[PDB]
């Protein structure tokens, strides 16, 4: 549940030492934060390792082993396909909540009233 807020802030009516020192006022805004984009990372490292394992033992020749190189090519193709498709699927769907653009309008429909 929501953590208690009674007796936390520094106010004239509060007799004790304040517990929380908010950086900004605890006012519920009418817009949620934008979804952060995930930082990318290198891919197919484990397959490049086994591809170079062929070269290190076979004096850098591709006629010795072929399955590792083909698997690395398949991994590169799959990584490219995932980079292309996920870049448009993730910004569209989250599977757990509404898009931030719709959430902002929903919050503007029923905003908070810090005043009056």
């Amino acid at each position: 549940a929501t953590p208690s807020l009674r007796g936390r802030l520094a106010r004239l009516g509060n007799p004790r030492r304040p517990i929380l020192k908010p950086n900004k006022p605890l006012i519920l805004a009418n817009h949620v934060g934008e979804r952060r984009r995930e930082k990318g990372e290198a891919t197919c490292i484990t397959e490049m390792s086994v591809m170079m394992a062929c070269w290190k033992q076979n004096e850098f020749r591709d006629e010795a082993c072929r399955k590792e190189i083909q698997d690395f090519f398949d991994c590169a193709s799959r990584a490219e396909a995932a980079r292309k498709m996920r870049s448009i699927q993730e910004n569209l769907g989250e599977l757990g909540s509404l898009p931030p653009k719709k959430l902002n309008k929903l919050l503007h429909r029923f905003p908070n009233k810090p005043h009056v």
Binding site: A1, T2, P3, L5, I19, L20, K21, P22, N23, L26, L28, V32, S97, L98, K102, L103, L106, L107, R109, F110
Partner: protein, 86 residues
């Protein structure tokens, strides 16, 4: 040390699945808060900084809980408007 070994923070793999067992253990540690504590204990933090971090985290948790509660409350009104054009 004095406790018995292979009891705490131990997960048994299922049918040779190691990647999933490692993810399960990582989730165990994250939910128990050990990952954050280990990352924090690499360098000592002064008590003033610890208090500031605790206050900031508490305020952030309160704000996030209230925002999630309001989102769940207002989720009903996401339906299509029946009085369009009036």
């Amino acid at each position: 040390a004095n406790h018995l070994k292979f009891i705490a923070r131990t997960v048994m793999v299922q049918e040779g699945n190691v990647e999933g067992a490692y993810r399960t253990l990582n989730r165990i540690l994250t939910m128990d808060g050990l990952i954050e504590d280990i990352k924090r204990r690499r360098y000592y933090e002064k008590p003033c900084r610890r208090r500031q971090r605790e206050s900031y985290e508490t305020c952030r948790r309160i704000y996030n809980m209230e925002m999630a509660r309001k989102i769940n409350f207002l989720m009903r009104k996401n339906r299509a408007d029946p009085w369009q054009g009036c």
